[PDB]
Paper text:
F1Fo-ATP synthases are large, membrane-embedded macromolecular complexes that harness energy from the proton-motive force (pmf) and use it to synthesize ATP via a unique rotary mechanism. We solved the electron cryo-microscopy structure of the F1Fo–adenosine 5′-triphosphate (ATP) synthase from A. baumannii in three distinct conformational states. The A. baumannii ATP synthase has a subunit stoichiometry of α3β3γδεab2c10; its overall architecture resembles that of other bacterial and chloroplast ATP synthases. The rotating c-ring transfers torque to a central shaft comprising the ε- and γ-subunits, which protrude into the α3β3 hexamer, inducing conformational changes in the F1 nucleotide binding pockets, thus converting the rotary force into ATP synthesis.
State 1 was then used as a reference to build structures of the remaining two states. The central stalk is rotated by almost exactly 120o between each of the three conformational states suggesting common stable low-energy intermediate states in bacterial ATP synthases. Structural alignments of the γ-subunit between states revealed that the three states differ by almost exactly 120°.
Residue numbers in the entry:
A (entry chain O), G (entry chain P), L (entry chain S), M (entry chain J), N (entry chain G), O (entry chain H): 1 to 80
B (entry chain p): 2 to 52
C (entry chain g): 194 to 241
D (entry chain a): 15 to 291
E (entry chain e): 2 to 70
F (entry chain b): 7 to 52
H (entry chain Q), I (entry chain L), J (entry chain R), K (entry chain K): 2 to 80
The structure:
């Protein structure tokens, strides 16, 4: 019984932890290039920031799916 | 309880349509008016050139 | 000779070198020498 | 909520408005033989645009139109421009294809912005009106379109069109052919498993896998949407619902994106199939 | 705003004035130029150059070889 | 499995039914673009 | 029996999480050079949204596939 | 019942792991190819064709892993 | 009994790997940041402002995970 | 009993993980190759030729791994 | 029995990924720092200034993991 | 009896695929940079090709050793 | 018990295992960039090296601390 | 014993295969830059190759050490 | 207790592994830039090679520590 409980707890940990890593990496990769671009073109900064926000929202989708399912397992406690 | 959740959803949609009005309408409206005006300009140019 | 003179600081800003700085500088020296020759031709024509 | 959680467990994971021919129609049987009987809702939702554009087709003009007609010609111009300037195969009805499939996947993902729970708490009056309530308590209330079988049908339809072209460019012999840079092995059994089997599965599964992926594109995205809506359902009053709104906004932004790239890749396959070898 | 652009050859200049957009074919990357842009230098393809004033007009100059600062 | 096949076949029929109208709508705009060209030609002739 | 339920729960958890990771890295790889190119040619906005859309579609192929079937397991464990 | 969870985990590996591989690979392709077509917009289409060629080049074996996972899920070739 | 160590190690995984993701992401960020801020020293303040923007936008999910781990420790679920 | 599940797991690794190797390496190669052809469009033939050469040099180990895994799937040892 | 080893491994990995992240993030910071200093021999003080400004920003969550690990070693969980 | 057989098989296969990355990535990096070199100076394509083989013969040996050990386990694993 | 003793040994080993691996890679990248810069700056060797020693001391503090904890466990294993 | 026979098999696979990547990745990273240098410096190639082999031999010491450890475990395993 | 023998054997394998990876990967990182710079500046080859040795040994220390711990535990396994 405790086996299944440990399984679901570990699964919940999985879902948030890995997605956090992935979004961190995507964030850093965009940040370096975004800043270097702004350095290159210090002028058109608004739509640069705009595209940056848009693709940033594009990034986290499936990781947010994962975190949602993790909290699903936390509170709804499926199969528990 | 049920009413509470449904009212929460309704308040949510109120905030949505508040932001939907504020943010979504202007670009579409401006593009529509601009093309209508420019097509009118093309037609007027045709008429002027005919005359 | 004014290549080490007429200067007082090295600018913290600099250009990025889309081609190799070496070949870029080489092409530069090419143009500079050609321009020098050209103006010398002009001057001697005036002297004539 | 807890009983509401049980009702949610029963309700949303339903199949085709819980319909099964030659059997019952509200609680027939878990995973027994059945057919799709919710796609018609989306079919009619598409007939809605069919009439909305028959409006402009009959009310067609060369001058300045009304606002809605102007926006319609916006979209038509935009989509036609995109499809044509991207690439064209045979100039045979491809653009209407692309535009209708665009707006369909658009809408078919779109409706999900509505609440999951308003549909049953309203249609309970109709359920008590006709055809029982307890199987409705199990699962009989309509759900915004979330079956993948529609995606499977669309994907296979595209694949059939691909096959029709591949025989109409007659490249099927070369289409079976493939590029194999794996001719040798240093040992006997590995070369034995190399020559025939490796390249055979290679030429088999490559193009087969893609439409499957496309159908599951549609399904998984739209499914992720419904599940986010589902998790929003909890916290009946202690929540302020102020954080579901931003995700909903983001999801809206997505909707267009997946629909667009879907009809893109549709065009891409049609192009490559319409090309030599 | 705009910013000064000077089209100068060894014999003489060709065009001068303050401008806000420029199109140029670099030794490597093609380059678009705007005022305030980070200082840069590169070699240029021997092709034409397009420069865009704020008056809704864009000049053209045909160049064979040269460098951009 | 049956619903899969019915969705397949039935979506295509609807698309086929709606095919003529999209093309008609698309052509009806190119004429507006044509007028500007005609006006330019008339100016050139003038 | 419940042990195999936890087994499939873990399979699905790691499945969806790995999909999230792959997407969260691929999107970043795309966006970096996307912003860089935008910085290079501000005028080419239409083609660059075009290509970026194309590639973003080409990217996510397997991840949310496994996501979908894993959640299918969550609702219908594909076994007893 | 143990073998069932075993093969379920195995299929999880089979598809997700290649999913990582494909996602990162095509991400790199997109970045580099995007940079390139920015460099010569004039050379976009044939380069896109090249890209499609290499896309077909890469995706072969990940699809194989997906197919193996599907085969196992539909019919485990075991108890 | 085993659930104690199980949830404890789940929390440890969450917080530790979140630390990994943060640290390495900020390292990647800071590299190109140092590059750019060196290239254009005059923009340093507004560059810092953009850095603050992305810094906030960056590591929220690790904070979520570490908080959930701490709840799992003290206000333990799965009991 | 369990031996079948372990053999399946091993085969899944054998095919999937080298599928990563092919995916990632081909990703790098495709990016660089497209860069190169962007440099010299005229030299595309020899570029493609070198690409075929190196890719063919690559896949041998993946071929071995996937063949061995398929052998287990059809004819496992340690029955 | 088991819970003891569980919490031991939990604390170990806590500190272990903490240290991994710290080391690699520091390397990533330093590389670009040093190359920038080479290009700009002038502004080394303010570069170092911002460098520590962001370094202190960096090791935060790793320091949190350090605190968690030390607490676990001294004041463990339930068992 | 399941223990030794299953573990031997697992170890052999992981040896193999883990080398699969070894060869794949090492060769991928080498080939990418070779392509860069031939892009710069296509003249030395065969000389750089020679150096390429010089590296190819140098990168692959240990993975081949792992392959042989795995095959030894497959045919006659030295164990009980 | 002896299971737990082996587990504590596992933990103590594994801590310094990652610690050494991460510190080694961090010095690897950091020093590689050192060689780059100092090669580009043959005269700036002393000040650069001073910074190098500062940052190298700054790098592996927490790693050496974890190593000390591992040795503490090796001599005095707690949680017996 | 069979339990621990498999355990020894696993540790051996760790050592051997793990060295396989360590060497393969080190060699690929070496060779990429080496080809770069050959491209830039088609004259200094001899000493280039000498330093290359010097550092490469400096690399694979601990890898071959692990290989010897693993093959020692294969033939004449310890803790018998 | 054989289980504990497998435990500690696997732990030592991990230790020696991580040392090997640090050595190989860091050495490749250094060598890339070493060869790059020396091809750029063959003049500074003695001084820069000196710094290269200065940092190479400055890298692998804690790797060697882990290696020694693992080797000792092979010879004299603690906690028996």
């Amino acid at each position: 019984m405790e086996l299944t409980l440990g399984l679901v707890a570990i699964a919940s940990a999985i879902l948030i932890a890995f997605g956090a890593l992935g979004t961190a990496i995507g964030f850093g990769l965009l940040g370096g290039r975004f800043l270097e671009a702004v350095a290159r073109q210090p002028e058109l900064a608004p739509q640069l920031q705009t595209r940056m926000f848009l693709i940033a929202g594009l990034l986290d989708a499936v990781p947010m799916i994962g975190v949602g399912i993790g909290l699903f397992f936390i509170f709804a406690n499926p199969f528990v | 309880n049920i009413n509470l959740t449904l009212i929460g959803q309704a308040i949510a949609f109120a905030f949505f349509v508040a932001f939907c009005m504020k943010f979504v309408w202007p670009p579409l409206i401006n593009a529509i008016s601009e093309r209508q005006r420019k097509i009118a300009d093309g037609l007027n140019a045709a008429e002027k050139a005919k005359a | 000779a004014e290549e080490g003179d007429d200067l007082n600081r090295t600018y913290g800003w600099d250009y990025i070198y889309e081609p190799e700085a070496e070949e870029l500088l080489n092409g530069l020296l090419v143009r500079y020498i050609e321009s020098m020759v050209y103006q010398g031709v002009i001057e001697n024509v005036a002297c004539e | 909520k807890h009983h509401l959680t049980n009702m949610t467990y029963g309700k949303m994971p339903d199949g085709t408005w819980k319909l099964a021919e030659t059997a019952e129609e509200a609680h027939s049987m878990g995973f027994t033989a059945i057919h799709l009987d919710s796609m018609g809702w989306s079919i009619g939702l598409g007939v809605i645009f069919c009439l909305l554009f028959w409006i402009v087709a009959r009310a067609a003009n060369a001058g300045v139109p009304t606002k809605f007609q102007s926006a319609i010609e916006m979209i038509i111009e935009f989509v036609d421009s995109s499809v044509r300037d991207t690439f064209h195969g045979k100039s045979r009805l491809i653009a209407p294809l692309a535009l209708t499939i665009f707006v369909w996947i658009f809408l078919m993902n779109l409706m999900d912005l509505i609440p999951v729970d308003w549909i049953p708490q309203v249609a309970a009056f109709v359920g008590a009106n006709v055809f029982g309530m307890d199987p409705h308590h199990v699962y009989f209330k309509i759900v915004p379109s979330t079956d993948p079988n529609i995606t499977l049908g669309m994907s296979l339809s595209v694949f059939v069109l691909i096959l029709f072209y591949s025989i109409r460019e007659k490249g099927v012999g070369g289409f079976v052919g493939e590029l194999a840079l794996n001719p040798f092995n240093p040992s006997n059994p590995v070369a034995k498993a190399l020559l025939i089997p490796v390249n055979l599965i290679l030429e088999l599964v490559t193009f087969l896998a893609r439409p499957i992926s496309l159908a599951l594109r549609l399904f998984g995205n739209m499914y992720a949407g419904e599940l986010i809506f589902i998790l929003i359902a909890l916290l009946p009053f202690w929540i302020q619902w102020a954080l579901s709104v931003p995700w909903a906004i983001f999801h809206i932004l997505v909707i267009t994106l997946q629909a667009f790239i879907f009809m893109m890749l549709t065009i891409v396959y049609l192009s490559m199939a319409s090309e030599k070898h | 705003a705009t910013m000064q652009c000077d089209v100068v050859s060894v014999k003489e200049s060709i065009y001068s004035g303050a401008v806000t957009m420029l199109i140029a074919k670099g030794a490597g990357g093609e380059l678009g130029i705007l005022p305030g842009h980070a200082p840069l230098v590169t070699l240029l393809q021997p092709g034409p150059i397009r420069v865009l004033l704020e008056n809704g007009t864009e000049e053209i100059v045909y160049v064979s070889g040269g460098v951009l600062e």
